[PDB]
Design brief:
This is part of a larger assembly, with two copies of chain A. Chain A is of the alpha+beta class. Chain A is about 45% helix and about 10% strand. Chain A contains 20 helices and 18 strands. In chain A, the strands form seven sheets. The first copy, chain A, has a four-stranded mixed beta sheet, sandwiched between helices. Chain A has a four-stranded antiparallel beta sheet with strand order 10-12-14-13. A two-stranded parallel ribbon of chain A has the order 2-3. The longest helix of chain A has about 40 residues. Chain A is globular and about 80 Å long. The interface between A and B is small, with 11 and 9 residues. Chain B: It comes from Mycobacterium tuberculosis (strain ATCC 25618 / H37Rv).
């Protein structure tokens, strides 16, 4: 049973893999609790699964919210650029809070498809903080371990390679030359410079979460230098906290069938589905008829050149380039057609084969090529797109001047100008331990919203009036519009005009912590003033 | 039949109000995560250590499985009856405890520092 778990670890190239049989959110919270303690700051991509935000609130961690680069043309968030991570890790150093940070907690493959480079980001972060920890949310990338050209972008393989590199005397000499080269350069300039880990100080620590059925049992891959020393007992206690028992044979007993299933036959289906995805992209790309209206976005669109740098070229870009794009998460763009993605899903396609459609942006639809995708699915998709193309061509040919102008404005209204995406605004001063940094207390703001006297409901129009009247609008709960299912407003997050504008134009299926017909939960002016005064008094009491 | 292990008050380092008997199990839980504040003492010497006058404060949830209920909780003043009960009971299912290494306990220096900080905080808050 333990031997079987070792076989599973071999399959995923981890050191110890733990199975959580209560969904992926349970495993996320388990890792968050095991690693983070109260106070210990945690960097996190704002788009991460909301389970991570709740785990941070439970563990009292001070979250530093990293924001991803926007894509206004397609109205999506790509990923957080490594330069931003370094800039944050150094902006903390100015205030002296850098010792606190314990988890980078990046997602490994964002919702839309963009793929991080774990090895490079860990190398460039372990230079600043040689004892940090990394939790890689691999929900959307669990399958991408069978294909060799995407294996090296997984958390476990990157961590293993980083571990081996640091222990090589060749890397010792390389680090010595690298350090000798940048003597006399201000530390603050390390953001604009390639960085390397210190071979002696750096300790790789990586935790990954994989859905069992995606390649509701979940998984936890652990490859940590100091697991038996600084996290073993804490990991067991978190496991007990969020699961009936600490790791036991029964949890392991389930694994053996899954390990056989994946190690014998699973990977072949992943390779096959990747081939289907690549073929489908080529067919849209090459076909004379589809390509008139339908474009599948690729690296050149979702990845701005600033973050960019045959078979050998392909492998080298996927091994060294910062941002690549997963083939199996297609982002079909229909701005030319002039129809909204919601309309496309409703009328034309929706789902009729192994293919699923997860979200539908303003002028696109994200198509996922899951493990149930066969040749017939490619044929069906191509035929549907072809029929739509011929119908559109016929309509355009038969269209008059007025009809052509109407079509042109349809394309203009959903292709040229789109609302600017909202970024994380700020934490309210009363929920920020030190005013120098930009991390806030998300737990205090969480429970501080329970008080009915402190909380109030404000309408969108009244919210705009208040902002125009200079009244801070602080949220009191997680507002989670559910196109991607990640929070827009977190407890205590200051509300900005961009947030109101985005919220004022939402027809999404599901929203949590939002009651459009009643108002929006926001801290009252008196409550915020009281909390800010209390925080200022607490800070001043130390100087007494 | 040895008497059952009745709950023993939370250690004075983890009690927000010294007058009352309610502890702070969250701080005791997280304060035990540290490795320099945790110590292992074998059961055979727990009674001797208590006799000397030390305050043995546990750091983990000791939960003998078949009973299903925690004998010890973080910040609990390990008492002699609990020592005897744990020594006698030898069921292999005991979460948060092991009989080969020892019984997790806050180191006396850690307890002194925590209690000093708690006393300072209580004095300042009252003022």
């Amino acid at each position: 049973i333990k031997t079987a778990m070792d076989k599973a670890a071999v399959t995923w190239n981890a050191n110890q893999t733990y199975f959580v049989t209560n969904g992926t959110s349970t495993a996320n919270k388990i890792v968050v609790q095991a690693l983070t303690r109260p106070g210990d700051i945690v960097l996190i991509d704002r788009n991460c699964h909301k389970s991570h935000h709740y785990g941070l609130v439970l563990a009292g961690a001070y979250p530093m919210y990293l924001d991803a680069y926007p894509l206004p043309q397609y109205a999506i968030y790509g990923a957080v650029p490594l330069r931003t991570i370094k800039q944050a890790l150094l902006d903390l150093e100015a205030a002296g809070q850098l010792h606190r940070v314990r988890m980078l907690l990046l997602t490994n493959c964002t919702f839309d498809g963009v793929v991080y480079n774990p090895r490079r980001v860990m190398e460039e972060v372990l230079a600043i903080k040689p004892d940090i920890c990394f939790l890689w949310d691999e929900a959307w990338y669990a399958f991408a371990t069978a294909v060799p050209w995407a294996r090296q972008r997984t958390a476990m393989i990157a961590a293993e390679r980083l571990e081996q590199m640091l222990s090589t005397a060749e890397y010792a000499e390389e680090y010595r030359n690298w350090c000798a080269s940048m003597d006399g350069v201000d530390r603050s300039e390390w953001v604009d410079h390639r960085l390397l880990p210190d071979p002696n100080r750096a300790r790789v620590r990586v935790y990954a979460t994989h859905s069992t059925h995606k390649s509701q049992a979940s998984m936890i891959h652990v490859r940590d230098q100091d697991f038996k020393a600084l996290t073993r007992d804490a990991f067991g206690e978190a496991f007990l906290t969020h699961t009936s028992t600490s790791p036991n044979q029964q949890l392991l007993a389930s694994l053996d069938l899954a390990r056989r299933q994946v190690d014998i036959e699973g990977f072949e289906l992943v390779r096959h589905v990747y081939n289907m995805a690549l073929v489908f992209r080529h067919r849209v790309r090459k076909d004379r008829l589809i390509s008139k209206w339908f474009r599948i976005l690729d690296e050149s669109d979702l990845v701005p050149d600033a973050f960019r740098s045959a078979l050998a070229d392909w492998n080298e870009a996927w091994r060294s380039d910062q941002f690549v794009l997963d083939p199996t998460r297609l982002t079909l763009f229909i701005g030319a057609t002039g129809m909204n993605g919601y309309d496309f899903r409703e009328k034309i396609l929706m789902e009729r084969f192994g293919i699923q459609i997860n979200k539908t942006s303003i002028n696109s639809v994200l198509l996922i090529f899951t493990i149930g995708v066969t040749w017939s699915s490619v044929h069906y998709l191509l035929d549907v797109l072809r029929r739509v193309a011929i119908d559109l061509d016929r309509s355009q040919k038969a269209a008059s001047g007025a009809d052509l102008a109407l079509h042109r404005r349809h394309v203009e209204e959903i292709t040229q100008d789109l609302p600017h995406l909202p970024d994380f605004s700020e934490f309210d001063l009363a929920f920020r331990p030190d005013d120098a940094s930009s991390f806030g207390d998300m737990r205090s703001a969480f429970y501080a919203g329970y008080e009915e006297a402190d909380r109030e409901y404000v309408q969108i129009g009244l919210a705009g009036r208040r902002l125009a009247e200079g009244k801070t609008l602080v949220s009191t709960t997680f507002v989670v519009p559910y196109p991607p299912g990640f929070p827009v407003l977190v407890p205590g997050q200051l509300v900005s005009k961009e947030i109101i504008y985005f919220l004022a134009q939402l027809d999404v299926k599901e929203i949590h912590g939002y009651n459009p017909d009643l108002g929006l939960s926001v801290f009252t002016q008196a409550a915020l003033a009281r909390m800010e005064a209390a925080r200022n008094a607490v800070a001043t009491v130390g100087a007494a």
